Amino acid sequence: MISLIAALAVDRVIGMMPWNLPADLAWFKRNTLNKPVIMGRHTWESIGRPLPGRKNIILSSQPGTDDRVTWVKSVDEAIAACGDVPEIMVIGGGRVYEQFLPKAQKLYLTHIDAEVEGDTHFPDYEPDDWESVFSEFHDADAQNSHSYCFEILERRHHH
Numbered sequence: 001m002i003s004l005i006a007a008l009a010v011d012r013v014i015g016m017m018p019w020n021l022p023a024d025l026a027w028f029k030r031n032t033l034n035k036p037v038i039m040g041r042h043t044w045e046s047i048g049r050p051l052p053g054r055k056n057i058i059l060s061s062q063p064g065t066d067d068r069v070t071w072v073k074s075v076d077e078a079i080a081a082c083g084d085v086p087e088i089m090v091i092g093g094g095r096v097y098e099q100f101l102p103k104a105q106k107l108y109l110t111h112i113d114a115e116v117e118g119d120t121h122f123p124d125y126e127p128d129d130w131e132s133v134f135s136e137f138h139d140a141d142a143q144n145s146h147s148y149c150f151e152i153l154e155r156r157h158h159h
């Protein structure tokens with residue numbers, strides 16, 4: 001099964017960080033550890049080093065040479081490279097989320113209370129097609145710059 005995981009500012013702006021949220025990074029790690037992660041080449045270059053404890057699959061029509069990750073050229077190849085696993089995590093960026101959304105059955109979202117200047121957005125999804133099965137709000141604190149709300153949604157309908 002395919003899931004997307006993303007952190008969204010107001011207006012669904014995503015980035016590679018205008019905010020400083022170690023709690024969100026802990027949420028990201030907890031929910032991706034021991035699962036393959038699929039990302040586009042822009043996201044890969046922004047991370048710079050393979051995420052530990054996860055198979056790192058990079059979707060790009062023009063692969064790099066880095067032997068530390070697995071390079072694939074299509075959504076279908078990305079999925080095949082993951083093989084028989086319970087859950088595949090798609091970690092962005094904008095275009096990769098857009099291509100994978102139709103195949104996804106679960107969303108892990110962090111809704112951040114920040115207005116920011118970026119131009120890359122998380123895909124449009126029809127809220128009526130999803131059910132909110134978890135939500136938790138957290139205030140900002142000495143370690144986290146903004147307030148945020150974790151949410152998990154499960155797909156109920158497809159169009």
Ligand SMILES: Nc1nc2c(c(=O)[nH]1)N[C@@H](CNc1ccc(C(=O)N[C@@H](CCC(=O)O)C(=O)O)cc1)CN2
Pocket residue numbers: 005006007015016024025026027028029043047051052091092109110
């Ligand atoms: N919800 C959430 N989802 C996301 C991101 C986020 O920002 N938060 N960011 C996007 C991908 N970018 C990164 C950049 C850095 C890291 C990263 O470095 N993670 C460490 C944890 C951080 C650390 O302890 O050093 C890890 O092992 O997972 C993860 C995703 C995609 N999805």
Ligand SMILES: [Cl-]
Pocket residue numbers: 026027030
């Ligand atoms: Cl957590």
Ligand SMILES: [Cl-]
Pocket residue numbers: 039040041042043044092093094096
């Ligand atoms: Cl990308």
Ligand SMILES: [Cl-]
Pocket residue numbers: 141142143
């Ligand atoms: Cl505090």
Ligand SMILES: [Mg+2]
Pocket residue numbers: 065066067
């Ligand atoms: Mg090689």
Ligand SMILES: [Mg+2]
Pocket residue numbers: 094095098121122123124
């Ligand atoms: Mg889009």
Ligand SMILES: [Mg+2]
Pocket residue numbers: 098123124
């Ligand atoms: Mg769309």
Ligand SMILES: [Mg+2]
Pocket residue numbers: 128156157
């Ligand atoms: Mg319904």
